[PDB]
Scaffold this motif. Structure first.
Motif, PDB file in Angstrom:
ATOM      1  N   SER A 147     -17.523  45.968 -15.196  1.00  0.00           N
ATOM      2  CA  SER A 147     -18.076  45.506 -16.463  1.00  0.00           C
ATOM      3  C   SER A 147     -19.312  46.283 -16.894  1.00  0.00           C
ATOM      4  N   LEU A 148     -19.915  47.081 -16.011  1.00  0.00           N
ATOM      5  CA  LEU A 148     -21.122  47.805 -16.393  1.00  0.00           C
ATOM      6  C   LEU A 148     -20.837  48.875 -17.431  1.00  0.00           C
ATOM      7  N   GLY A 149     -19.581  49.346 -17.497  1.00  0.00           N
ATOM      8  CA  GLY A 149     -19.157  50.313 -18.488  1.00  0.00           C
ATOM      9  C   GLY A 149     -18.918  49.760 -19.873  1.00  0.00           C
ATOM     10  N   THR A 150     -18.779  48.434 -20.021  1.00  0.00           N
ATOM     11  CA  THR A 150     -18.475  47.836 -21.317  1.00  0.00           C
ATOM     12  C   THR A 150     -19.460  46.799 -21.759  1.00  0.00           C
ATOM     13  N   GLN A 151     -20.277  46.263 -20.861  1.00  0.00           N
ATOM     14  CA  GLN A 151     -21.041  45.062 -21.140  1.00  0.00           C
ATOM     15  C   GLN A 151     -22.534  45.322 -21.002  1.00  0.00           C
ATOM     16  N   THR A 152     -23.292  44.665 -21.857  1.00  0.00           N
ATOM     17  CA  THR A 152     -24.745  44.744 -21.867  1.00  0.00           C
ATOM     18  C   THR A 152     -25.345  43.543 -21.127  1.00  0.00           C
ATOM     19  N   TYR A 153     -26.261  43.806 -20.205  1.00  0.00           N
ATOM     20  CA  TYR A 153     -26.953  42.752 -19.473  1.00  0.00           C
ATOM     21  C   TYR A 153     -28.446  42.810 -19.769  1.00  0.00           C
ATOM     22  N   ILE A 154     -28.963  41.733 -20.348  1.00  0.00           N
ATOM     23  CA  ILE A 154     -30.373  41.582 -20.685  1.00  0.00           C
ATOM     24  C   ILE A 154     -30.878  40.266 -20.110  1.00  0.00           C
ATOM     25  N   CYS A 155     -31.981  40.321 -19.358  1.00  0.00           N
ATOM     26  CA  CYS A 155     -32.640  39.091 -18.943  1.00  0.00           C
ATOM     27  C   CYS A 155     -33.758  38.745 -19.922  1.00  0.00           C
ATOM     28  N   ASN A 156     -33.885  37.441 -20.221  1.00  0.00           N
ATOM     29  CA  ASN A 156     -34.862  36.884 -21.156  1.00  0.00           C
ATOM     30  C   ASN A 156     -35.878  36.092 -20.351  1.00  0.00           C
ATOM     31  N   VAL A 157     -37.118  36.555 -20.368  1.00  0.00           N
ATOM     32  CA  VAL A 157     -38.196  35.967 -19.598  1.00  0.00           C
ATOM     33  C   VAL A 157     -39.209  35.373 -20.551  1.00  0.00           C
ATOM     34  N   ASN A 158     -39.681  34.178 -20.218  1.00  0.00           N
ATOM     35  CA  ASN A 158     -40.687  33.483 -21.004  1.00  0.00           C
ATOM     36  C   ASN A 158     -41.773  32.923 -20.086  1.00  0.00           C
ATOM     37  N   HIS A 159     -43.023  33.220 -20.432  1.00  0.00           N
ATOM     38  CA  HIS A 159     -44.204  32.663 -19.774  1.00  0.00           C
ATOM     39  C   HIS A 159     -45.057  32.024 -20.862  1.00  0.00           C
ATOM     40  N   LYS A 160     -44.775  30.768 -21.219  1.00  0.00           N
ATOM     41  CA  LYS A 160     -45.567  30.086 -22.250  1.00  0.00           C
ATOM     42  C   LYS A 160     -47.077  30.157 -22.009  1.00  0.00           C
ATOM     43  N   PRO A 161     -47.597  29.896 -20.803  1.00  0.00           N
ATOM     44  CA  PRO A 161     -49.052  29.975 -20.598  1.00  0.00           C
ATOM     45  C   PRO A 161     -49.706  31.275 -21.059  1.00  0.00           C
ATOM     46  N   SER A 162     -48.982  32.403 -21.118  1.00  0.00           N
ATOM     47  CA  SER A 162     -49.565  33.670 -21.572  1.00  0.00           C
ATOM     48  C   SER A 162     -48.974  34.147 -22.892  1.00  0.00           C
ATOM     49  N   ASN A 163     -48.180  33.307 -23.574  1.00  0.00           N
ATOM     50  CA  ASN A 163     -47.380  33.696 -24.748  1.00  0.00           C
ATOM     51  C   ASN A 163     -46.558  34.979 -24.517  1.00  0.00           C
ATOM     52  N   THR A 164     -46.090  35.228 -23.295  1.00  0.00           N
ATOM     53  CA  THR A 164     -45.300  36.427 -23.015  1.00  0.00           C
ATOM     54  C   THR A 164     -43.811  36.126 -23.212  1.00  0.00           C
ATOM     55  N   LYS A 165     -43.129  37.021 -23.920  1.00  0.00           N
ATOM     56  CA  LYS A 165     -41.681  36.975 -24.075  1.00  0.00           C
ATOM     57  C   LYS A 165     -41.172  38.393 -23.908  1.00  0.00           C
ATOM     58  N   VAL A 166     -40.356  38.607 -22.887  1.00  0.00           N
ATOM     59  CA  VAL A 166     -39.791  39.909 -22.575  1.00  0.00           C
ATOM     60  C   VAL A 166     -38.273  39.781 -22.555  1.00  0.00           C
ATOM     61  N   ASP A 167     -37.601  40.751 -23.163  1.00  0.00           N
ATOM     62  CA  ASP A 167     -36.168  40.972 -22.986  1.00  0.00           C
ATOM     63  C   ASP A 167     -36.023  42.341 -22.329  1.00  0.00           C
ATOM     64  N   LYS A 168     -35.479  42.382 -21.113  1.00  0.00           N
ATOM     65  CA  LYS A 168     -35.323  43.623 -20.372  1.00  0.00           C
ATOM     66  C   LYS A 168     -33.839  43.875 -20.099  1.00  0.00           C
ATOM     67  N   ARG A 169     -33.322  44.962 -20.662  1.00  0.00           N
ATOM     68  CA  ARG A 169     -31.972  45.402 -20.331  1.00  0.00           C
ATOM     69  C   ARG A 169     -31.960  46.009 -18.932  1.00  0.00           C
ATOM     70  N   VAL A 170     -30.942  45.647 -18.171  1.00  0.00           N
ATOM     71  CA  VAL A 170     -30.805  46.056 -16.780  1.00  0.00           C
ATOM     72  C   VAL A 170     -29.567  46.924 -16.676  1.00  0.00           C
ATOM     73  N   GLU A 171     -29.755  48.188 -16.302  1.00  0.00           N
ATOM     74  CA  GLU A 171     -28.702  49.190 -16.236  1.00  0.00           C
ATOM     75  C   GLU A 171     -28.705  49.884 -14.891  1.00  0.00           C
ATOM     76  N   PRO A 172     -27.574  50.468 -14.482  1.00  0.00           N
ATOM     77  CA  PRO A 172     -27.601  51.340 -13.300  1.00  0.00           C
ATOM     78  C   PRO A 172     -28.484  52.537 -13.600  1.00  0.00           C
ATOM     79  N   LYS A 173     -29.084  53.111 -12.561  1.00  0.00           N
ATOM     80  CA  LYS A 173     -29.940  54.277 -12.753  1.00  0.00           C
ATOM     81  C   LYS A 173     -29.110  55.565 -12.747  1.00  0.00           C
ATOM     82  N   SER A 174     -29.564  56.548 -13.541  1.00  0.00           N
ATOM     83  CA  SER A 174     -28.881  57.836 -13.687  1.00  0.00           C
ATOM     84  C   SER A 174     -28.836  58.602 -12.371  1.00  0.00           C
ATOM     85  N   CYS A 175     -27.628  58.852 -11.866  1.00  0.00           N
ATOM     86  CA  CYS A 175     -27.449  59.538 -10.579  1.00  0.00           C
ATOM     87  C   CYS A 175     -27.987  60.965 -10.667  1.00  0.00           C
TER      88      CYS A 175
END
Lengths: 220, 214
Positions: free
Chosen positions: A192-220
């Motif tokens: 599925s890594l060849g067709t699908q996008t994986y993003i984790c959504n992180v929230n830290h209300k105490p610091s008003n932080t909102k991050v969306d980080k795409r997670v991919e294999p690293k370039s060989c």
């Protein structure tokens, strides 16, 4: 119906003070005894204090005698806990609780407010990919390292809620710096890594932080 | 205060088993003993009051007995929605005091972990730290051993572990272990590996990488 709402939780340097409040509706608050109970992270319930409807007595757990003060304002339908000389070991979720009788009933518990006592200071997380690596078949694990934040909690979702199967988000650990770190992982078909996008959504209300980080294999 | 000591602290049983939880007080509490059930993110529920009376609406498979300083909660035939944490609470005296709790978990068959290792990201290395992460997925029972090795040298004191609760679908656990190094100590070494020992594994499983995709 019956509800209890705590407010006033946050972070506190050791030796300092914080005041909690709890507001009541749906029952005759002016005739009920009212308690505080706390629960440190994945530890047991600990009874803190009680006050009767008229304030004529105030009782306290041994570990908080002389530092905590319980009080009430039946006018406003609200309960207070005044905490002074706070220590690391007072870190916990604080609940107000009552009863239509004498003993605690689940109907009469608040949602809780977290209190964290520490020399560390509020800090938003850094979000790092845990990148997956045979990609024609099999199972790949991937995730996000949510590091060096304070206080608890963070929330982690994946693909904005559309990916829940196979997700494990681990309980934070307290590093020696006073800052929290946790990991969130998911196993997916490696093809599925060849067709699908994986993003984790992180929230830290105490610091008003909102991050969306795409997670991919690293370039060989 | 009156100190309440529950035992065991954790318990694994199967549906249909008979479960018994003990609570000892440091002095007499007559019969003023309560038992509560707590599921995570739920308010505690009163099961038993004054040592043996069943609360309204609580399955008759729950019972309690005792007086004085020794008390027992018993579940005759353990049902699926009874895996939870159970607290005793004395109300003979203020301060009220809870016991430390008893977690009742589900029994199931051995299941060996799938093991995965993750190098540190370039982004974190720019910041001067390296976290190496080892994942043990979907295993049973909870006991596992994770040993970090750097160029074959055992490591100690520089990692932390966390474990999930039992999965709702398959009753297994997962565990995450993080090794933390300074960027400087990380680039002084080549081979990074976590070695996993578990019952469902005939011998230890090692996963490794070589710094710099080698």
């Amino acid at each position: 119906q019956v509800q209890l709402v705590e407010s006033g939780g946050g972070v506190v340097q050791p030796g300092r003070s914080l005041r909690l409040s709890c507001a009541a509706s749906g029952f005759t608050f002016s005739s009920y005894a009212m308690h505080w109970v706390r629960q440190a992270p994945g530890k047991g319930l600990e009874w803190v204090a009680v006050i009767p409807f008229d304030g004529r007595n105030k009782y306290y757990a041994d570990s908080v005698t002389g530092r905590f003060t319980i009080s009430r304002d039946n006018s406003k339908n609200t309960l207070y806990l005044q905490m002074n000389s706070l220590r690391a070991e007072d870190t916990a979720v604080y609940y107000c609780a009552s009863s239509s009788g004498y003993l605690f009933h689940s109907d009469y518990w608040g949602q809780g407010t977290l209190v964290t006592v520490s020399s560390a200071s509020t800090k938003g997380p850094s979000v790092f990919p845990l990148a997956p690596s045979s990609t024609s078949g099999g199972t790949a694990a991937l995730g996000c390292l949510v590091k060096d934040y304070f206080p608890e909690p963070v929330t982690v979702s994946w693909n904005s809620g559309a990916l829940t199967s196979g997700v494990h988000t681990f309980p934070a650990v307290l590093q020696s710096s006073g800052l929290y770190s946790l990991s969130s992982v998911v196993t997916v078909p490696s093809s599925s890594l060849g067709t699908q996008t994986y993003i984790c959504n992180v929230n830290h209300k105490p610091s008003n932080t909102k991050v969306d980080k795409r997670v991919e294999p690293k370039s060989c | 205060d009156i100190q309440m000591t529950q035992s065991p602290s954790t318990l694994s049983a199967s549906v249909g088993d008979r479960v018994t939880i003990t609570c000892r007080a440091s002095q007499s509490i007559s019969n003023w003993l309560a038992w509560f059930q707590q599921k995570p993110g739920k308010a505690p529920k009163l099961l038993i009051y004054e040592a043996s009376s069943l609360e309204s609406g609580v399955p008759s498979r729950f019972s309690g007995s005792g007086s004085g300083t020794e008390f027992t909660l018993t579940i005759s035939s353990l049902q699926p929605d009874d895996f939870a944490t159970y607290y005793c609470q004395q109300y003979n005296s203020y301060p009220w005091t809870f016991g430390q709790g008893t977690k009742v978990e589900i029994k199931r068959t051995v299941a060996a972990p799938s093991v995965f290792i993750f190098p540190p990201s370039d982004e974190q290395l720019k910041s001067g730290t390296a976290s190496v992460v080892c994942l043990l997925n979907n295993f049973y029972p909870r006991e596992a051993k994770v040993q970090w090795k750097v160029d074959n040298a055992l490591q100690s004191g520089n990692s932390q572990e966390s474990v999930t609760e039992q999965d709702s679908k398959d009753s297994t656990y997962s565990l995450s272990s993080t090794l933390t190094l300074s960027k400087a100590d990380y680039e002084k070494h080549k081979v990074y590996a976590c070695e996993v020992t578990h019952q469902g594994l005939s011998s230890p499983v090692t996963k490794s990488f070589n710094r710099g995709e080698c």
